[PDB]
Every structure is written in C-alpha cells, then in structure tokens.
Amino acid sequence: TLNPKAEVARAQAALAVNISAARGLQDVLRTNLGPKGTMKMLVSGAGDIKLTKDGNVLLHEMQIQHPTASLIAKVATAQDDITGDGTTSNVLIIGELLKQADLYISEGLHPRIITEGFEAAKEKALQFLEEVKVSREMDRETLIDVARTSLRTKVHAELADVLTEAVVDSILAIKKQDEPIDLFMIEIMEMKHKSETDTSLIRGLVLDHGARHPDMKKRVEDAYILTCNVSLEYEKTEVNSGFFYKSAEEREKLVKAERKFIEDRVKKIIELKRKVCGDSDKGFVVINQKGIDPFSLDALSKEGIVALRRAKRRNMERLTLACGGVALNSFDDLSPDCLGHAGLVYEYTLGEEKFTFIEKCNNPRSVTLLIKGPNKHTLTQIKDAVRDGLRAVKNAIDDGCVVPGAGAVEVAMAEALIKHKPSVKGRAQLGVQAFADALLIIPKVLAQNSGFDLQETLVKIQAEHSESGQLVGVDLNTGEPMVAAEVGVWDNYCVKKQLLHSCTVIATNILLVDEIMRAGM
Template sequence: MAAVKTLNPKAEVARAQAALAVNISAARGLQDVLRTNLGPKGTMKMLVSGAGDIKLTKDGNVLLHEMQIQHPTASLIAKVATAQDDITGDGTTSNVLIIGELLKQADLYISEGLHPRIITEGFEAAKEKALQFLEQVKVSKEMDRETLIDVARTSLRTKVHAELADVLTEAVVDSILAIKKQDEPIDLFMVEIMEMKHKSETDTSLIRGLVLDHGARHPDMKKRVEDAYILTCNVSLEYEKTEVNSGFFYKSAEEREKLVKAERKFIEDRVKKIIELKKKVCGDSDKGFVVINQKGEEKFTFIEKCNNPRSVTLLIKGPNKHTLTQIKDAIRDGLRAVKNAIDDGCVVPGAGAVEVAMAEALVKYKPSVKGRAQLGVQAFADALLIIPKVLAQNSGFDLQETLVKVQAEHSESGQLVGVDLNTGKEDAAV
C-alpha cells in the first residue's frame, strides 16, 4: 500500500473490510434504484440528461446505459446486466436485484466472522444445484402461436401498460413467425422497426413487407401501385458533392454550362441503365415499375402484400418521441424473448414461482454440503427470494406475508406457486 501512495500521493486506499463494505454498499445502492422497476406493476423512471433531454423507461438495460455510474463495482454489475441483455434480451433488472441480494446476504455472515472464500464455495455449490433444478422444472412444449403469445405478453407487460402490451404481443409473435425458416436460425435483423410520430401507440401494427421512411421523389409519381416490380438500389439519383471541401472556378459562362451538362449527363446515364434493366426484367407486362430511392424525408413508402415475405416491419406509432422510444425498447425485448423460446423449446413459470421452488430445493440440498459452505448455500437460497418479495411489494402487498403464503402453498402442494399480482394471493404458476 505504501508503494501505491508513493506513486500517487492522492490515491485513496481501502483495506479488506472497508473495501468490502464499499463494494457491497454500491451493489445495494444499484439494487435500490432498480427494485421499483421489476414486474408489470413496476414504476417508470424519468432520466434527465445534462442537456435537458428526457427519457421515460422501466427497462433496466436502458437505465444502466443512461445513468452515469462512477463506482467501479456498480459499473461492473451494470456490465453484467448489459451482457445479460445481449444474450437473452431481458432480465436485466432481475439480474441486478439478485446480485445485490447475494452480496447483502453474504455480508450478514461476513459480519459474523465468516471468510468470504467460504461464502463463494457455498455460492458455487448452490449455483450447480440451481442449474440442475432448472433442468428439472423447465416445461418442454411445442412452440405454437398461443404459447409464444404467452411468452411475449409476459415480457412486454413488464415494459409497457397492459392494453398496449396486448396490442404489441400479436405483432411481435407474428413478425417472428413470418421470418422463421425451417431448420435455420432466426435472424432478428429481418424484422425492421420503423417509427412514425402519428396517432396513438395502440395503432402500432405489423406490416408484412417493408416501410421506408420517404415518399415519392417527384410530385407526378403514382401514390399507389399494385402488383408492381420494385427495384431497390443503394445509389443516389442526385448529383453528389465530394466528401472533401472542393470548389470550381469558371473562366466563362460557357464553361459553367458545360459543367451543368456534365452533371445532368451523369444522372441521365444512371436513369437510362435503370430503364434498360426494366425492359429486360419486366418485358411487355402491364405491371408497374417502382424505383425506391434511399433518400427522402417525412413521407413513408409502404411495400405490402408480398408473397412469402422474409422481411417484415413493425411500424411503431405514437404521439411523441418518448412513447416511440419506450415502445421500441419493449419490442426489442419481446422479440428476443420469443426467439429464445423457439430456440430453447421450453419455458419456466414466472411470478417468482421458480425462485421460491429453487430456494426450497437449495435448503433441502444444504445438509449434503460439507462444512461452513452450507452458509453460502443458505445465503444463495435467501437471495433468490428477492424476486417474489419485490414483485409483491411493487404490487402494493405486504412482502413478508405474501412470501410466507407462497412458500406454504408450495410446500403443501408440491407445485410451482407464484404471486398473483392482482390479488396478492398465492397461485399455481402456468
């Protein structure tokens, strides 16, 4: 430590117990911020940037990205949650809550003199047992449309209000089913998310085709074409300026006219090539021919009623930017949830049912662990109960009373029992 002070006199050095206390405090602080977000009854957070920009969200991943976290331990936990979002697309808030609770439970034993190494041994043993338990309770099902709708609804209702979630659910599931190919991995990049500041959020819909954020390039172009040939191109039909600053100097008006003609010829040559391609591709049919250019503003072009569309568009509508951003974040999580369900071919019940059952299984497993590592297993089991506790608390019910009822019902029935967030009573999870 003296060497650190020699190299940097301003360095702050925290020794064993003090460093541990600071790290646990940071984790619990992050937990306190996010715990009110969990579940469909969770609350929104308003984030205000230094420039005054406002963002409303209850998505844990968005909050962790937008908050300016300076503490290294809290920053590390945020990165873990971000990795969780990258892999599964959801569960970031639950992740942070469980991490914070693991450290909180561990601190209770460490304060009594138990070495952290013993706690981690118990955590490792509990983790292996928990993974085995998950394999036992998972429900393998055929991922038909109804099952996927239940999965999507569960995810979306934790991000937006119930009425909007029900509207988005079918659109999300149908978009995945539209791009799904037999025996091929699902590519979510084939689902385009387009924003339109128009009408209300419940007008969000699935377009089985493409929606482009620009309209016609000329006022005389047709506003509607059916059974059309469509050319999509990534070249501009306007004269483009150079990427570096440059200028032209004319000696006479004739030279300027020559330059204008050269610019016009540059575009006309491209148009002629498109016309020649039309003759080759379209022949003498009566079908329309549409050129969709990549540039434009405000107006939208819809390409619908395609045969066997392999790319679809979720058209998000809303009265303001805040609503559009919130729906977009929710849809991304919903898409990932449905994709994961199809890839895994199985589901587990929600409402804290798995956590309650897993905690009981770990308590029964504890006597088989040798020595003081049993305390680490007990701490792991107690930490898992943070999920049903917070779900009940955010729904306005007494967390201890609710948890006791759920645990008692699970012990008596042997079934997976969760928290009914509408009544606060225990209910068999489906």
C-alpha cells in the same frame, strides 16, 4: 505505516463499502420490477427525458457515483447481450446475497467459505431447472403468454395486447425450416403524427423518401423493381474532358452538355420499362438509391413509373431480396437480370410527411415492425420493449424449454436448497442458506411494488404445498398465491440459467475483495 498519496482499507471495511453499494443499488432498481413497478427517469442534462424500467438502460446509459456500483453496471451489459432479460433481478439477488453474507461475516465467518456454499447451491439450483422446465411445443398461445409476460413489464398494460400479436407474428414470419432466428431480418421503423396504439406490422420494407411528383401512381399493384445505384442528377464529366467556360452563358452550355450524360440513361429506364412486359396490365418501379433530377422524375412519371431516391445501403440489400433485381452500378449495362417483382406498393400519408411501403412481397425473408407514437421519448420506450419482447420469443424458440414465473422457481429452489446438505464441508451450509433466502427477494419485491405486505405474500406461496409437483407464485392483482401455468405466466430457461451463473460469479468476486487501494486517484 503508510506512504504519502496512498490509502488502503486493510480491515473488512472494504466489504462493508462494497456491500453497502449493492444494498443501495438494490433499493433503487427494486421499485421497477414487474408491470406494477414504478418507472425511472433518465435526464441527459441537455433537457431530454427518457422513461424505462429496463435495468440495462438504467445501468448502461445512466451514470453512477459509487465506483463499486459501476462494476455491477457492466455486468448488466453482459447479462443483456446473452439472454436479453433479467438484468434487474440480477442486481437484487447480488444485493441480497451480499446482505446475507454480511450477516454471517460479522459472526467471524471467512468470505471464501460463503463462496463455496454458493457454488454448491448454484450447481443444485441449475439441476432444479431441468426438472421443472416445461418443454412445451412453440405455438401461438404459448408465445402470447411469453411475449405478454415480457411486454407488460415495459408498457402501461395497454400496448401489451397490441404489441403482443405483432411481436409474436414477426418471429413466426421469419421462423421456418428450423433455421436459427436472426433479428436482422426484422427492421424497426418509427413514425410520428399518430398515437401510440396504432402500432402494427408491415409485411415488407418501409423507406423514408418516396415519390414526390404529381404524375406518379398512388399505388402500384405490381411492378418489375429495378435495383440501381446511379445518380441521375448533375454530375462531373465522366469522359476525357473537363469544364471550361468563359461566362455564365457558356457555363450553362456545359450543363446542357453535361446533362446529356444522364439524359441518354434516363431514356434507358424507359426502354427496359417498355421491354419487359410493357403491355397493359403491367407496371414498373425504380428503387435507385442515389439522387434523381426532377427532370428524370418528371419524365418517367409520364410513362407511369414510380421512381425513388435517397435510400440507405441496408434498405437496398433488403429490397433486392424482396424483389430480386440485382443492383446495377452503371446504366450502360442495363438488362432484365437487374429486375425483381413485388405486389402492392403504395404511399402512406401522414399529416406532413409521407412514406413508401412495398407490402405483398414474394420471398423477402424479412419484415418490418412499424412503430407509431405521438412523443419522441415514447418511441424510444416502445422500441426498447419490442427489442426485449423479440428476444423473449427468440429464446423461447431457440431454447424450446420454458419455466414458470412470478418467483415460483425461486420459491421452489429455496425449499430445494434447504433440503440439501453439503459434500465438501459443513460450514458451506451457511452459504446455501444465504443463497436460499437471497432468491426470495424477487417474490418479496413483487409484493412491495403491487402494494401488498412483503411477509404475508411470501408466507402464503411458501406454505402452499401438496403431494404432487405444484407451482405457486405471487398474484400481483390479488396478492394471493397463483399457479403460473394456469394463467399464462412463463419465463425463459436461459434467463434463469444465466441468472444463477451471473449472480453467483459477481457476488463471489465482490466477497473476495480483501482491500481497496487507490492507484493514484
């Protein structure tokens, strides 16, 4: 009973295939959970190498053979865009949920009954977060523990203390007036020719191309920055004429005639320089994005003017807010309205290249995080960590409530769900038990990666009880129980909230798959 070029698993083998894929994907990502976890390599085939523990990069950039596992890979892309963390632990709970469901499905239990238990435990699990969430006011010490909790899971425990104070202050630099935090206010710049621990913050923007001339000021303590988008190089005839030449010499005359289109405007830069506070103890800067001839760079440098060239559109918008000068699309209509103001503008010198820095701005409402590293892959590694550390502090401030870590919520919610009977049917009690034992994979895996026994660590933290609200978690260094609040180990509320809603939805839908049909594969 079948047609040619068609195949379908009518029995429960479709679940055994999907359940086997989740177990395989569980065993892969469980080794990179936490700081003690191992790293995964990402070979692009062409020879590039990239190391990272972030589950989203191991699911978005990497390729997976199993078709069913590619569905869960797309889920991590959704989990990353909403919260920014919890993609690895999301896959572990799905595998352990499906593992416990297979134990009961083999006993003749329908899949739909198990999904009803997850929906009941999930609603109870969400209420437990509201009871244990600590609405501590955001301060420096609290965010240090949060950023440390996020950055330690992506570095070698050496860049954590270095990157922690930088990531914390980056948000605080843009966090004020109770405004929604925007990550577009912080730009991430990379630099070679230095080690990894030299990462530090820059109060202002950083540009790739800088002043290239001997007669330039190495540092400008103050200047009226002029924003412009007009090229001061050889351009086409802008008047009702054209280029007509008879020889190489007559062609050179057209260059002299065409260069007059810029020579009248290059002196215009000298005019507004002398005009707006051209006396002593003053300065002037040009940030014209388009190209500039070496003549104009040579001319203006004699007047003591730092002129830049070949910048990006995004940098020009940030530069205007830092300085205040509006972009002039034509030098003919020059005025002081196109000027701004800034503090120290120096040039950072590397072994080969050099970069422009506009530090000490007045009101930029934006900063830059200067990353430095010796290798190319190490720059992409640290960049992925800072982006995860920034979203961690963003969620902590956007959502002022935080929760403990170290699997303390999972150990607590597991005991809470066991002490909770259904209200729709009795057989949902089995699905609640599967949800309880599934959350314990996180404190189980953290004991494995730290090199401790899986069963001894969980039994200690689960046996620890008292006549008061008490938290308890896994100590990755000692393996003994640990109160996360007494050490500074905190997670976000939206991460754990979206985790329960994400795992329940996907573990549900995977269990509702009754048959797998090939659509002409």
